[PDB]
């Protein structure tokens, strides 16, 4: 559970925002890419796994689960690549409401940034610092620290 | 000291690798950019501050310290922008041996990657997971979680 992440891909402004969510805390990392290819997904996961101890990734769709480039990055970085079938139906709704939350935040900042990538990173910042009480960024550090100890 | 980071800019292959080091742990984040500009430095700091609780950044040179764009991102993200003067002369040496270490690692992976950006992220991953024993990625989570508690 400290090591479990979920990929999520949402669209805005004719571009693609790829998100990784740490399931137990709700902490996120995200980037803007022009399209969701195995090469872009693979690089994103290599970045994530060098920053946090990523044990398993639930992929966002079957193309990224099938992609040999994505499996090559998960092999390189020591990640268990898994499907993202919502066996617990609560997952679909949680992801959908996180996407709606992030798009709401992005609209609230959007005129402070010329480029969408800036607005998405301001939205990641606001999401991870929001106290709901602790923030997701506090929760992820507590969880992984408890696991290390 | 849980909140203090140092910027560092090194070059390879005609490109610039911008690095942020968390001083108390030695954990790093890095990216490849075509040139150091205030705009690229500012966006890197926005990314870093949405992922870790960045209180102070010691800038890598006087152009990034002077840059109004960098100061604007430090204002946005709540970061105290400071100079990088090595009042403790041990800092110069630590940074230099970190860049030599990263370049060493990059050479050891370089032929597994077509693009330098992949190699630099493989080197971030190896640096942060290396046990010297706790790793830098273990030390940063411990330090921050101890601070939150």
């Amino acid at each position: 559970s400290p090591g479990i992440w979920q990929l999520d891909c949402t669209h805005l402004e004719g571009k693609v925002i790829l998100v990784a969510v740490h399931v137990a805390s709700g902490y996120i990392e995200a980037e803007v890419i022009p399209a969701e290819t195995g090469q872009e997904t693979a690089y994103f996961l290599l970045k994530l796994a060098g920053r946090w101890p990523v044990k398993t990734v639930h992929t966002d769709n079957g193309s990224n689960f099938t992609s040999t480039t994505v499996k090559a990055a998960c092999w390189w970085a020591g990640i268990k690549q898994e499907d993202g079938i919502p066996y617990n139906p609560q997952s679909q709704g949680v992801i959908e409401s996180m996407n709606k939350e992030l798009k709401k935040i992005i609209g609230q900042v959007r005129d402070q940034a010329e480029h969408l990538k800036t607005a998405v990173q301001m939205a990641v910042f606001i999401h991870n610092h929001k106290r709901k009480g602790y923030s997701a960024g506090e929760r992820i550090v507590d969880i992984i620290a408890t696991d290390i100890q | 000291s849980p909140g203090i980071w140092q910027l560092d800019c090194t070059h390879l292959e005609g490109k610039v690798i911008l690095v942020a080091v968390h001083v108390a742990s030695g954990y790093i984040e890095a990216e490849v950019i075509p040139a150091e500009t205030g705009q690229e430095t500012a966006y890197f700091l926005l990314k870093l501050a949405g992922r870790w609780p960045v209180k102070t950044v010691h800038t890598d040179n006087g152009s990034n310290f002077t840059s109004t764009t960098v100061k604007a991102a430090c204002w946005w993200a709540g970061i105290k922008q400071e100079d990088g003067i090595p009042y403790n002369p041990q800092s110069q040496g630590v940074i230099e041996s970190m860049n030599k270490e990263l370049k060493k690692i990059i050479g050891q992976v370089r032929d597994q990657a077509e693009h330098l950006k992949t190699a630099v992220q493989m080197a971030v991953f190896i640096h942060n997971h290396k046990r010297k024993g706790y790793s830098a990625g273990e030390r940063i989570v411990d330090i921050i979680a101890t601070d939150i508690q």
Partner: peptide, 8 residues
């Protein structure tokens, strides 16, 4: 071309 980021 036999690389992680370019398997071809």
């Amino acid at each position: 071309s036999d690389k992680i980021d370019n398997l071809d």
